[PDB]
Write a structure and sequence with these properties.
5 helices; three-stranded parallel beta sheet; 161 residues; elongated; manganese; ribosome biogenesis; binds zinc ion; EC 3.1.-.-; rRNA binding
């Protein structure tokens, strides 16, 4: 009776920060660090409403992030909650919800489909030019349109996204 639910989905700490009513699983790891009132009452209520169920990842799932992470460089430079949520969803091959700069990247290189929020920029810029040699990014054409880092020519590129 009346058991509407989405497909598999895992929710991050940040989802309980913004006020995003959604369903799925939550990490008993991250909730230990959730000290606010909004992000408590909301999380606990959705839990008790059976919108979200408790699940922490397998070790191999954590180690999965470590593999691709040590290949991209920042291996443990990411927070534990971050790794924990992401890992779990990769074991389920389901879905994720978050809106962090690293969280977005990791799910990207891991190939896992996720949702994120209506922000757009909070410090970053657009850009539109690329060196051909050292592959340096530019937002403008340098003098001669040549690379102040390798001397090679610079050319235009497609959209950021
Ligand atoms: Zn260059």
């Amino acid at each position: 009776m009346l058991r509407n639910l989405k497909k598999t989905l895992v929710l991050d700490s940040s989802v309980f920060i913004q006020g995003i009513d959604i369903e799925g699983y939550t990490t008993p790891s991250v909730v230990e660090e959730i000290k606010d009132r909004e992000s408590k009452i909301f999380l606990e209520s959705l839990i008790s409403a059976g919108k979200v169920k408790i699940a922490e990842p397998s070790k191999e799932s954590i180690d999965r992030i470590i593999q691709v992470a040590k290949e991209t460089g920042e291996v443990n430079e990411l927070s534990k909650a971050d790794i924990e949520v992401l890992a779990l969803a990769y074991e389920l091959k389901g879905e994720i919800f978050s809106d962090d700069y690293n969280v977005q990247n990791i799910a990207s290189l891991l190939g896992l489909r996720f949702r994120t929020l209506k922000r757009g920029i909070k410090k970053v810029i657009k850009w539109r030019y690329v060196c051909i040699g050292c592959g340096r990014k530019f937002s403008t054409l340098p003098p001669g349109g040549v690379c102040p880092d390798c001397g090679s020519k610079v050319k235009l590129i497609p959209r950021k996204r």
